[PDB]
Nucleic acid binder design. Structure first.
Lengths: 176, 53, 84, 1111
RNA sequence: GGGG
DNA sequence: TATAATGGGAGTCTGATGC
DNA sequence: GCATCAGAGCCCTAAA
């Protein structure tokens, strides 16, 4: 949801020694998949410090307890001899799609709000095929395919979905 | 922009357009309930977009 | 502009509706000192005439006019917004 | 990914340098890089040679030189300066009465320089000079509309370089000459030339009734001198016909190679048409004391033989592109230079007849103000000098190649008719038949064709390959239209085996007329289909399938495409998208072979073989004229091995060197719940999520602090009656801090101005006295964010007076400029378009779960309504989608050239290979055909789409080859009852965005005289309720609504003031009073000495001024 | 000069 | 406030109606 | 007949 890069006042900046502009850097931080092991933890802040001729990937974030980076191979910035990178990324748990203009999250004065795709679900398909109990025909065999980023697992997703749908049917209880 | 969901007698009107077009009406109403103490203060509040509650 | 015309009318209307709620008369001594649509600002000399008192006294009810106005103003703080 | 290129046409030559019409024209005009003795007499040089020597003392021209620019280009744009070079001229003064020689190099001012890409910087803003089409000088013969059997010979010179001449043959039988709208018998002018009755009889006579009709006895009764005096009285009623005075007038109008200039192109056309050879560019000469004819008799000779019917005499088509020529940047600028030079010459002669005829040098004799003014006038205020279109690189590339028939020396809208706007047969290969404006300007503004070049004379030439026997050589000949009409030219796609024409019958043109011809008759052949169309049109794949009217819109709209941060090249290209980026100069390339030393956001350093370390700085987030961001990004990595001409950085709207005007999205062609209605477009929220169609825009704000008679304006952080919350983002000096979000109402630059004698009113004095606070000396004039604008502050420029290098316009102490940036996500009301002319505004953004999706879960990006296709007849977009479907699964992009492209069988082959990937994956993953896929197939087999009696895989494949797929409604889960066209389309986000256009006003600024609201969003204007709007209200009988429009909502001052007061008090609006503009009308009629009286029923005057205007 |  | 000085420079097509 | 005159669609944007 937010990024603070050292010696950077806003998104349209550019870093000496870094190939990518800040717009692209944040575009790369939007692909970061960050799993919270502790269910009670609603927000963290990742730290990165890099220099020299290195290609910073997501692994290089300084490790924090109860937080696992599911895609440590993701490219972040290409640094060149003398290029220095220091940042603080605020990662949150949330639902749906909340655009940067909406949340405006800034940990400090120079923080850049980032577009948040909270939803862990990358793709959902379902097959419906013909089946029989050998007595009856035109029965349905339902197969739900669920792809996720790994922060939550296809099974956990399916249970939350079912739990949401069940919880929704309760609302039909009290008439007027 | 097309508005299929509209009834024949309706149109979609952007809220920000409506605030300017009806601005005098809005000031009186902002006093009647109370969003501002009086008409002059209400106008001062619409001037800055972040002061709009 | 329409806004400006409205404002001037509203300022004059609260200004008189403010000098009479203390008293019309100590508001009358003060009203003579500035002038609504007159611009009757001089100083100590001319003030020799018709207020109702002699001459140093009005320089006091002017303070008492302004002071009584000042307390009553914090309640009817509606004139604050005309400060732009 | 793979790039599969189609087409069998081998193009023998590449496209010419695309900006050469600009670059070559101006280089030729200035000749700055030529050593003076080697300059040819053209451009600036020719102008000097024409103006000098200046006679009485003789001032003679030696040579000129151009200095280096005082400031580089970047600096000029920053400081609002013209990018220009100092011009000097070495002049020698000679005294004809003495022998005296004084020589000096005088400074004539600056001349604007063209940048490398063909544009100009004039007062800090980038400009383009548009080429102008017009009638070539020469001698023309057109049929006389009045007499169906007679003809007019017209001698037309270069614009402003002479009169138009008409030689009509009158009903009386005598040949008449028309000059400056006056007519007389031509015989008189013939006698002045020294002609005798014998010469005209002996030369012509062959035409029985015509040659004798020119002979008039009274005219012959006088020597050549008497005829010259006689003619002058026929032209200047009131000027005494003094023999030296008459000679002067006639010489300057006809024989003077200074006041009368046929073109150099005029000279060639005249020599060629009449079969004579001209000694110069004038119609006659003054030689050995009398006048000697050059043009007039040959023109008369041609006219009579044509009137008769002599072989070799034809009428001229005035719209033929051999008779219509282009005036390029160099020529246009040089004309204004010649004008400015002539004005300076007036100053020289006037100064040589005053203040001591001796004590003068050339430096005091010359005032350069007339020259500087003519040049500054051309670049700033000419109609051909336009603000650059630099929305995207193609915008400016297209702008430079545009051709206008309007401007100073051309048509008007109020004055141009069908013949000029038409597409002439000779436009083939020269002027694009597609790219023209819709509306009043149709056909007047056009675009240079891709392979066309303007020759030295100004005629547009197009390339053709020679065909000898049946063998096609590789030698290419650039032809004018006149020269092209001689041969039989085969089409570019005519079949070839090797270099041989392989068909027994070829499709060819003779004088534009299509004709079927045997290979023995083939003289030349087209180089390519690209040569018929403009650069924008050549960017449209499958153009052969698009109706021209929509292709036009396709062309023009690419000009309007906004550079996107994720911009991509189309998956179906035409093969021109590489050249456009390269010639545009937005992209950065490697000079020689080398190794990449350094790669930064700000710069790229390359170590070449030469050993030199070259540093290429990158333009980063610079604001173009239209506020789209020009920004270059590094495409190479440290240590990468590069060859000569390899890509280093991507410009805006370019991806790896290919033109990127938009994005490639997955589109479904189908109605969707009326959100698709009448060209509206439905898009997926997934597009915003992944930042498709997001673009950066920068707005510039400026404020001046000036000296006033009331005291100085000051830019300060101290602003009366404002809280610290309001000032929070302002620095010590009163300027907003770089990197702040500013929203409407926020202060950008604080400024105070001294209060007028409006020195606070006694009402305000007493109020101020109550709060212990004295009314301040200064008022708050601060610059604020306008309604609807705002963003992040990315830059500030402050320029004071008294800082090194800066001096402002008189009275202005300091200027502050604030650059504010915004990232614009696509939103409802933004406009999208493809290259085929499909355009629509985004009416709905659905969440991804509502979007139609493939069985395997992939949701579509865009839903386009099929109702836009059939009336519009642009099917190329359909073929684009099909080939785009294949590429989505095959992972490929294609190059399908126009008119030599991917055809249906070839697309079907690709589509079959795709189905295997779209389906075979599924069968292997352990899933069979879906129940709903069976239901759609049932309905599809009822439609004749699939063959009845085949397996579901076979039938789905039959549908996939038609580009249709099974589509699931994300709302229901049920299928769409029929197979739907789905594929990848290239769609651009155009420059028309609701954020820019939404506007509203309650009350605001009023006009001085009319007291009616000002116009336009930038002035906070009101809408115009015009004559036709009033008619509508009248037809509704809405009398009170209309009256409100005419009074309370406009210029009824008492009414508008009173109505506002009522609304804020909750009362109903009062009855209106007299509109102030009616009072203006009354007073304006009185100024015309007319008494206008408003009367009552008793006919007594009613005073609408309420006593104010009566004594 | 662009938009409808 | 005084040699004498003496005549200017420059550039579409419609239909309706009064000489 | 021929010249002289006054007509020649609307709203909007940005540049000056």
């Amino acid at each position: 949801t937010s990024v603070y890069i050292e010696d950077v006042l806003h998104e349209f900046s550019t870093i000496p020694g870094v190939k990518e502009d800040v717009v692209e850097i944040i575009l790369n931080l939007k692909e970061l998949v960050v799993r919270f092991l502790n269910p009670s933890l609603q927000t963290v802040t990742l730290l990165l410090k890099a220099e020299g001729p290195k290609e910073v990937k997501a692994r290089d974030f300084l490790p924090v307890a109860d937080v696992e980076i599911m895609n440590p191979d993701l490219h972040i910035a290409t640094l060149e001899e003398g290029g220095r990178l220091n940042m603080e990324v605020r990662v949150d748990r949330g639902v749906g799609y909340v655009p940067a203009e909406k949340h405006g999250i800034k940990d400090r004065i120079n923080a850049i709000p980032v577009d948040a795709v909270f939803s862990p679900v990358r793709r959902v398909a379902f097959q419906v095929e013909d089946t029989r109990l050998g007595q009856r025909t035109d029965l349905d065999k339902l197969t739900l395919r669920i792809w996720t980023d790994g922060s939550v697992t296809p099974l956990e997703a399916l249970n939350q979905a079912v739990e949401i749908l069940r919880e929704h049917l309760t609302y039909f209880s009290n008439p007027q | 922009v097309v508005g299929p969901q509209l009834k024949l007698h309706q149109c979609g009107l952007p809220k920000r357009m409506a605030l300017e077009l009806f601005k005098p009406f809005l000031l009186k109403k902002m006093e009647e309930k109370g969003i501002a103490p009086n008409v002059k203060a209400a106008r001062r509040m619409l001037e800055r977009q972040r002061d709009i509650k | 502009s329409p806004v400006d015309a409205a404002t001037q009318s509203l300022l004059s209307e609260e200004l008189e509706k403010a000098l009479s709620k203390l008293s019309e008369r100590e508001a009358m001594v003060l009203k003579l000192r500035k002038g609504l649509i007159d611009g009757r600002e001089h100083t100590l000399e001319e003030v020799g005439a018709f207020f109702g008192v002699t001459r140093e006294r009005i320089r006091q009810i002017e303070n008492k006019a302004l002071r009584k106005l000042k307390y009553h103003e914090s309640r009817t703080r509606k004139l604050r917004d005309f400060l732009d | 990914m793979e790039i599969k290129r189609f087409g069998r046409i081998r193009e023998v030559i590449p496209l010419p340098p695309l900006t050469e019409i600009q670059v070559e024209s101006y280089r030729r005009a200035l000749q700055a890089d030529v050593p003076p003795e080697k300059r040819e007499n053209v451009g600036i040089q020719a102008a000097f040679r024409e103006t000098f020597p200046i006679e009485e003392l003789v001032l003679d021209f030696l040579e000129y030189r151009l200095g280096e620019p005082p400031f580089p280009q970047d600096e000029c744009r920053e400081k609002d300066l013209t990018y220009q070079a100092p011009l000097y001229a070495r002049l020698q003064l000679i005294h004809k009465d003495t022998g005296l020689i004084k020589e000096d190099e005088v400074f004539l001012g600056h001349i604007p320089l063209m940048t490398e890409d063909g544009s100009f910087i004039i007062n800090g803003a980038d400009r383009v000079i548009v080429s102008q089409i017009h009638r070539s000088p020469g001698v023309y013969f057109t049929p006389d509309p009045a007499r169906p059997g007679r003809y007019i010979a017209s001698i037309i010179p270069l614009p402003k370089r002479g009169p138009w001449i008409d030689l009509e043959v009158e009903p009386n039988g005598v040949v008449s000459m028309k000059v400056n709208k006056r007519k007389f018998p031509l015989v008189l002018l013939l006698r002045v030339l020294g002609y005798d009755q014998e010469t005209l009889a002996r030369e012509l006579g062959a035409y029985g009734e015509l040659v004798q009709g020119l002979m008039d006895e009274s005219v012959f009764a006088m020597r050549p001198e008497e005829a010259l005096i006689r003619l002058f009285t026929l032209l200047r009623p009131g000027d005494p016909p003094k023999r030296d005075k008459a000679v002067a007038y006639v010489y300057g109008l006809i024989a003077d190679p200074r006041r009368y200039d046929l073109g150099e192109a005029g000279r060639y056309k005249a020599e060629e048409k009449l079969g004579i050879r001209l000694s110069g560019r004038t119609l006659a000469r003054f030689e050995d004391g009398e006048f000697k004819d050059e043009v007039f008799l040959p023109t008369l000779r041609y006219l009579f033989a044509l009137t008769a019917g002599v072989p070799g005499h034809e009428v001229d088509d005035i719209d033929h592109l051999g008779n219509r020529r282009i005036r390029t940047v160099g020529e246009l600028m040089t004309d204004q230079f010649r004008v400015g030079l002539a004005r300076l010459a007036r100053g020289v002669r006037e100064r040589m007849l005053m203040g001591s005829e001796d004590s003068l040098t050339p430096a005091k004799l010359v005032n350069s103000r007339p020259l500087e003014a003519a040049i500054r006038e051309f670049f700033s205020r000419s109609q051909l000098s336009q603000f650059k279109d630099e929305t995207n690189p193609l915008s400016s590339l297209r702008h430079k190649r545009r051709i206008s028939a309007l401007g100073p020396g051309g048509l008007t809208r109020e004055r141009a008719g069908f013949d000029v706007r038409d597409v002439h047969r000779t436009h083939y290969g020269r002027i694009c038949p597609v790219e023209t404006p819709e509306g009043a300007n149709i056909g007047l503004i056009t675009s240079l064709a891709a392979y066309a070049r303007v020759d030295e004379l100004g005629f547009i030439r197009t390339p053709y390959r020679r065909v000898v026997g049946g063998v096609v050589t590789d030698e290419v000949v650039y032809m004018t239209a006149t020269e092209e009409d001689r041969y039989t030219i085969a089409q570019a796609n005519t079949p070839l085996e090797g270099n041989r024409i392989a068909a027994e019958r070829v499709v060819a043109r003779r004088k534009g007329e299509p004709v079927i011809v045997s290979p023995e008759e083939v003289e030349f052949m087209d180089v390519s289909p690209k040569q018929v169309f403009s650069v924008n049109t050549n960017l449209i794949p499958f153009l052969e399938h698009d109706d021209a009217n929509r292709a036009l819109m396709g062309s023009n709209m690419q000009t309007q495409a906004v550079p996107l941060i994720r911009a991509q090249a189309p998956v179906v290209m035409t093969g021109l998208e590489e050249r456009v980026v390269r010639d545009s100069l937005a992209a950065l390339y490697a000079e020689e072979d080398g190794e990449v030393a350094k790669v930064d956001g700000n710069r790229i350093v390359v170590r070449y073989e030469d050993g030199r370390l070259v540093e290429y700085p990158l333009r980063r987030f610079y604001r173009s004229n239209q506020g789209t961001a020009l920004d270059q990004r590094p495409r190479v990595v440290v240590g990468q091995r590069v060859r000569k001409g390899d890509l280093l950085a991507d410009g805006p709207a370019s991806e790896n060197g290919f033109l990127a005007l938009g994005q490639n999205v997955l589109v479904a062609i189908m109605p969707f719940d009326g959100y698709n209605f009448e060209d509206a477009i439905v898009i997926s929220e997934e597009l915003l999520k992944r930042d498709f169609y997001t673009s950066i825009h920068i707005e510039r704000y400026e404020i001046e602090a000036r000296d006033t008679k009331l005291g100085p304006e000051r830019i300060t952080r101290d602003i009366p009656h404002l809280s610290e919350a309001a000032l929070r983002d302002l620095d010590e000096e009163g300027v907003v801090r770089i990197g702040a979000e500013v929203k409407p109402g926020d202060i950008l630059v604080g400024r105070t101005s001294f209060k007028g004698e409006s020195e606070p009113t006694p009402e305000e004095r007493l109020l101020r006295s109550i709060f212990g606070e004295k009314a301040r000396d200064v008022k708050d004039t601060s610059l604020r964010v306008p309604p609807g604008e705002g963003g992040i502050v990315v830059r500030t420029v402050r320029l004071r007076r008294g800082d090194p290098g800066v001096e402002l316009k008189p009275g202005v102490r300091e200027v502050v400029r604030v650059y504010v940036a915004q990232k614009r996500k696509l939103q409802v009301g933004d406009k999208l378009a493809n290259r085929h002319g499909n355009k629509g505004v985004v009416a709905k953004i659905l969440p991804v779960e509502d979007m139609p999706h493939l069985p395997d879960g992939t949701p579509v990006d865009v839903i386009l309504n099929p109702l836009g296709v059939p009336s519009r007849m642009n099917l190329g977009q359909i073929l684009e989608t099909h080939l785009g479907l294949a590429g989505y699964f095959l992972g490929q992009r294609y190059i399908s050239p126009i008119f030599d492209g991917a055809k249906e069988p070839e697309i079907k082959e690709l589509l079959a290979q795709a189905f295997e990937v779209y389906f075979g994956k599924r069968k292997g993953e352990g899933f069979g055909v879906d129940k709903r896929e069976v239901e759609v197939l049932r309905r599809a087999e009822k439609l004749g789409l699939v063959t009845p009696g085949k397996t579901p895989e076979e039938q789905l494949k039959e549908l996939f080859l038609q580009g249709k797929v099974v589509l699931y409604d994300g709302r229901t889960g049920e299928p769409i009852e029929g197979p739907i066209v789905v594929g990848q389309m290239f769609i651009m986000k155009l420059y028309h965005m609701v954020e820019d256009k939404m506007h509203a006003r309650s009350t605001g600024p009023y006009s001085l005289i009319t007291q009616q609201p000002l116009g336009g969003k930038a002035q906070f204007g009101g809408q115009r309720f015009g004559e036709m709007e009033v008619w509508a209200l009248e037809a509704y009988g809405a009398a009170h609504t209309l009256q409100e429009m005419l009074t309370l909502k406009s210029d009824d001052i008492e009414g508008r003031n009173a109505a506002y007061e009522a609304i804020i008090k909750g009362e109903d609006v009062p009855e209106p009073s007299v509109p102030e503009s009616f009072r203006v009308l009354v007073k304006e009629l009185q100024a015309l000495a007319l008494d206008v009286q408003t009367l009552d029923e008793k006919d007594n005057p009613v005073d609408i001024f309420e006593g104010l205007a009566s004594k």
